[PDB]
Design a protein around this ligand. Structure first.
Ligand SMILES: [Mg+2]
Ligand SMILES: [Mg+2]
Ligand code: NA
Length: 316
DNA sequence: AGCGTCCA
DNA sequence: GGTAGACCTGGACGC
DNA sequence: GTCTACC
């Protein structure tokens, strides 16, 4: 298929969004375990599926440049303002990150030192279905392997979009695509391990027991506490996966996912121990306490602060 | 040399 | 509710 | 990281 585009080579096909590097660093956000569907197919150019279409993104110092491959056999053209609005919404650019960074660093000198090096780590606003099933795949696993699982999931069950170079892009699967009684065994052949049952069972649960796709909108509109509790009914979704979905797709900025990294960070960088449990190792109680600790430290956007330290810890 | 343990 | 241990997969890497 | 089984 046609080539992945670069900004310098095809400038007619790109349009810009005002966005300084202090507000966004694509190389620190897109491969850091929020979305698993972006790839740096050319140096400094990131390609992936965003609102049912393939996009490539690249930055200059003050602008985010975007290009869209529409693949309806239409003539190539730069993104329209309406199309760019989807990219603006995905990166939540109405939130001003430099002001959050000032607050987090003011209350936390360790955060301040990390943030000096890791500018522009913000939170994507993801589709709830893509986020739910990607994070069901993430538990007790590593980002490289999760990325391959999500890719093969989309390849097998999501609609084909377009081919660029040797890469065939697919949309994320629907609930209905993942709900069949044959889907689990297929996802096992695709190497999802014991999470194959969780993906298929969770799709069935949403369709058969929760009212379908509208339930995720209910949870978007619900409090953090109510959305967090409700998600945990799903097979494979415990408190960490539920917090990932709350933070990254249901607009709960205070949700703080607590994984192996955040636990290591708490111990190493904060010398933290739980005070609501005599036993100090990970447990339902101590994981709950740690998320409350980070919220008390960083404030209402504590989950966004978590994403900064998580991105940095993947690099260290 | 590559098995087998650690780890995400 | 607290606790312990099993668990798919496959890269890192000590021995 | 979540599940299941046992206290
Ligand atoms: Mg054309
Ligand atoms: Mg559950
Ligand atoms: Na420090």
């Amino acid at each position: 298929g046609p080539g992945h585009r670069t900004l310098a080579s095809t400038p007619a096909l790109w349009a810009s969004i005002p966005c300084p590097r202090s507000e966004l660093r694509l190389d620190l956000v897109l491969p850091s375990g929020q979305s698993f569907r972006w790839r740096e197919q050319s140096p400094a150019h990131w390609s992936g599926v965003l609102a049912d279409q393939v996009w490539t993104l690249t930055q200059t110092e003050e602008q985010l440049h975007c290009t869209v491959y529409r693949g309806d056999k239409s003539q190539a053209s730069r993104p329209t303002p309406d199309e760019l609005e989807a990219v603006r919404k995905y990166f939540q650019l109405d939130v001003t990150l430099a002001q959050l960074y000032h607050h987090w660093g003011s209350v936390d000198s360790h955060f301040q030192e990390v943030a000096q090096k890791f500018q522009g780590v913000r939170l994507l606003r993801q589709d709830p279905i893509e986020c739910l099933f990607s994070f069901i795949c993430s538990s007790n696993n590593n980002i490289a392997r999760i990325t391959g699982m999500v890719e093969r999931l989309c390849q097998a069950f999501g609609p084909r979009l377009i081919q660029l170079d040797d890469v065939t892009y697919h949309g994320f699967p629907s609930l209905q695509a993942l709900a069949g009684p044959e889907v689990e065994a297929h996802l096992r052949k695709l190497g999802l391990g014991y999470r194959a049952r969780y993906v298929s069972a969770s799709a069935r649960a949403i369709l058969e027991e929760q009212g379908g796709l509208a339930w995720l909108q209910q949870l978007r509109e619900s409090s953090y506490e109510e959305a967090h509790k409700a998600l945990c009914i799903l097979p494979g979704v415990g408190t960490h996966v539920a917090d990932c979905i709350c933070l990254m797709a249901l607009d709960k900025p205070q949700a703080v996912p607590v994984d192996v990294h955040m636990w290591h960070i708490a111990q190493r960088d904060y010398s933290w121990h739980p005070t609501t449990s005599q036993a100090k190792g990970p447990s339902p109680q101590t994981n709950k306490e740690l998320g409350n600790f980070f919220r008390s430290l960083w404030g209402p956007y504590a989950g966004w602060a978590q994403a900064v330290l998580f991105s940095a810890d993947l690099r260290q």
